[PDB]
């Protein structure tokens, strides 16, 4: 398979041979073993769905088997429920979900609008009507970090800082430990501040919501805020750029969307299917598991290829065709079951406004096929971290 080699190929051929790899295996088998010793891969839709649905058999807690005595440092941090299983997940997500109601996401739409325009005006001032820039570095990445910052009611002054903090951490080392620890210190101050004097933001809501007599404490809230930033930053920025790139690579689709921007959310859903930011989702078998005509032994790492599931012709017609008019609703880009992305509404809103603004303001968006386009190094990500473009402002 040589998956590590693919992460080093030019992005265009990385995409190619990545989907060729998945295609070949998916063609023959729903499930299979990998070169890695005790790891299985999932290639087909139904089995991907089955895996995500059956959280009992396929755990999200990678330290499931670690003895309860040696579990203290293997335990997930207070507030982080992405790496835990019911019933611990249900209670924590229950609280966060109640607080993070759809109207919290909806209310951000005007700000996201204004922020996207401001980032574009900063790029335009430096290089004029024909302005070259890094779309991820100067637009999508700041927009994703600051949007999440806005959600939690982080002061306007600290936004450029938060954007830089996110770029540093996300793109072990003593610094990595520091960034995490200092973020901790910062967020505690933010929380106690918003607990004392509340404002219309998610931090204050997290601090004041009850669910059947239960609340979140300051240290859990820190984990939640931190979890949102870590889970949400890269993928959202990648969705915004993958949309720009996918439309660029399809002039007809692009023309349709430019002429009727109502088509854009549908286009984004297609992007999520056809070039998902997060390309795999991992689980750990708690027991011997019958899947795809095969038995997966207890203790096995399972790697669910979401990207392959989306190309499964059993589930999607003409799977390898990018079609902004397709019903992409069944895609798994935001996961499925109990761990389904809490940021999915916000990401769709973030992405829609960011590309809506770029198309309205720039009549030409030129993107190279060089190695100047730098895709994120992880096999589990598919999209750029450095995307140089040339923006020609509409006359
Ligand atoms: C387009 C961008 C995004 C993608 C592709 C994405 C994808 C995902 C996926 C696949 C999961 C499921 C992980 C699993 O099953 O174990 C997930 C969980 C999550 N995402 Fe996102 N996400 C995105 C943006 C965001 C944003 C903007 C936020 C909020 C700041 C966010 C917060 C979360 C949280 C909190 C979870 C965990 C929910 C849980 O564990 O129950 N995500 N995301």
Automatic annotation (TrEMBL):
<protein>
    <submittedName>
        <fullName>Cytochrome P450 113A1</fullName>
    </submittedName>
</protein>
<dbReference type="InterPro" id="IPR036396">
    <property type="entry name" value="Cyt_P450_sf"/>
</dbReference>
<comment type="similarity">
    <text>Belongs to the cytochrome P450 family.</text>
</comment>
<keyword id="KW-0349">Heme</keyword>
<keyword id="KW-0479">Metal-binding</keyword>
<dbReference type="InterPro" id="IPR001128">
    <property type="entry name" value="Cyt_P450"/>
</dbReference>
<feature type="binding site">
    <location>
        <position position="341"/>
    </location>
    <ligand>
        <name>heme b</name>
    </ligand>
</feature>
<dbReference type="InterPro" id="IPR002397">
    <property type="entry name" value="Cyt_P450_B"/>
</dbReference>
<dbReference type="GO" id="GO:0004497">
    <property type="term" value="F:monooxygenase activity"/>
</dbReference>
<dbReference type="GO" id="GO:0020037">
    <property type="term" value="F:heme binding"/>
</dbReference>
<dbReference type="InterPro" id="IPR017972">
    <property type="entry name" value="Cyt_P450_CS"/>
</dbReference>
<dbReference type="Pfam" id="PF00067">
    <property type="entry name" value="p450"/>
</dbReference>
<keyword id="KW-0560">Oxidoreductase</keyword>
<keyword id="KW-0503">Monooxygenase</keyword>
<dbReference type="GO" id="GO:0016705">
    <property type="term" value="F:oxidoreductase activity, acting on paired donors, with incorporation or reduction of molecular oxygen"/>
</dbReference>
<feature type="binding site">
    <location>
        <position position="283"/>
    </location>
    <ligand>
        <name>heme b</name>
    </ligand>
</feature>
<dbReference type="GO" id="GO:0005506">
    <property type="term" value="F:iron ion binding"/>
</dbReference>
<feature type="binding site">
    <location>
        <position position="89"/>
    </location>
    <ligand>
        <name>heme b</name>
    </ligand>
</feature>
<keyword id="KW-0408">Iron</keyword>
<feature type="binding site">
    <location>
        <position position="93"/>
    </location>
    <ligand>
        <name>heme b</name>
    </ligand>
</feature>
<feature type="binding site">
    <location>
        <position position="339"/>
    </location>
    <ligand>
        <name>heme b</name>
    </ligand>
</feature>
């Amino acid at each position: 398979n040589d998956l590590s080699a693919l992460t080093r190929l030019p992005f265009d051929r990385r995409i190619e041979e990545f989907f060729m790899y998945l295609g070949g295996r998916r063609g023959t088998e729903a499930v299979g073993e990998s070169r890695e010793p005790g790891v299985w891969e999932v290639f087909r839709y139904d089995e991907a769905v089955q895996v995500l649905g059956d959280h009992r058999t396929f755990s999200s807690d990678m330290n499931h088997f670690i003895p309860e005595e040696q579990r203290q440092l293997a335990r997930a941090a207070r507030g982080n429920f992405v790496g835990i299983d019911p019933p611990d997940h249900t209670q924590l997500r229950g609280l966060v979900s109640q607080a993070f109601s759809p109207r919290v996401t909806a209310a951000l739409e005007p700000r996201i609008g204004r922020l996207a325009e401001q980032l574009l005006d900063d790029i335009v001032a430096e290089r004029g009507d024909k302005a070259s820039c890094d779309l991820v570095g100067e637009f999508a990445g700041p927009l994703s970090a600051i949007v999440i910052a806005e959600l939690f009611g982080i002061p306007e002054s600290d936004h450029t800082m938060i954007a830089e903090w996110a770029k540093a951490l996300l793109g072990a080392m003593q610094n990595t430990a520091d960034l995490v620890r200092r973020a901790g210190e910062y967020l505690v101050h933010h929380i106690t501040e918003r607990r004392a004097r509340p404002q219309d933001d998610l931090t204050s809501r997290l601090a004041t919501t009850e669910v059947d007599g239960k609340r979140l404490d300051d240290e859990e809230i820190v984990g939640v805020i931190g979890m949102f930033l870590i889970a949400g930053y890269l993928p959202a920025s990648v969705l915004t750029a993958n949309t720009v790139m996918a439309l660029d690579e399809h002039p007809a689709a692009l023309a349709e969307v430019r002429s009727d921007p109502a088509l854009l959310p549908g286009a984004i859903e297609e992007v999520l299917r056809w070039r998902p930011p997060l390309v795999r989702d991992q689980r750990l078998t708690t027991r011997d598991a019958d899947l795809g005509g095969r038995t997966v032994p207890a203790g096995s790492m399972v790697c669910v290829w979401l990207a392959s599931a989306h190309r499964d012709p059993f589930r999607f017609e003409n799977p390898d065709l990018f079609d902004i008019h397709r019903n992409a609703g069944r895609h798994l880009a935001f996961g499925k079951g109990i761990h389904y992305c809490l940021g999915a509404p916000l990401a769709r809103l973030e992405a829609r406004i960011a590309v809506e603004t770029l198309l309205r303001r720039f009549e030409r968006i030129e993107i190279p096929r060089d190695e100047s386009v730098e895709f994120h190094e992880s096999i589990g990500v598919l999209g750029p971290v450095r995307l140089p473009t040339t923006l020609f402002a509409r006359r």
